[PDB]
Design a protein around this ligand. Sequence first.
Ligand code: FMN
Length: 138
Amino acid sequence: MKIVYWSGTGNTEKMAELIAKGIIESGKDVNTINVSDVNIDELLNEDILILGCSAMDDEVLEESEFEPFIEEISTKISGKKVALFGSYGWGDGKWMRDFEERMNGYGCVVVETPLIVQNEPDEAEQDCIEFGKKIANI
Ligand SMILES: Cc1cc2nc3c(=O)[nH]c(=O)nc-3n(C[C@H](O)[C@H](O)[C@H](O)COP(=O)(O)O)c2cc1C
């Protein structure tokens, strides 16, 4: 499987690493890829797309790299399974509710409840690992 993410200070990156750890612990292989290094064509062959991005202002996806990526793949992912995650700061998850609505709008099947964590995982570490285990059970 593959995990694609954008992280500005490392919070979401840390989540990505933990989610990957859960998938691997379940006996499966997974590669984490920063959005700047992703190859679209290779990503489109995946069964499940695991995507992550922190909340930028105001309650939107990161604009310079992550959103353009989402826009680019939007017309090629109908029927695909996706799992969403991200770290946020002061909000209540509005950016994620919108991210989930958007992916469903493109015809994607959002397989699990999106995982959101405030700031760095730390206390939510096991939660991240378990989220990965849930995805490996799909
Ligand atoms: C310019 C900017 C705008 C932000 N806007 C929001 C926001 O609208 N809602 C929110 O909850 N957090 C907001 N945050 C906080 C980040 O989502 C939060 O610090 C998160 O932990 C960053 O994770 P990352 O290191 O993976 O980027 C913003 C951060 C930055 C730098």
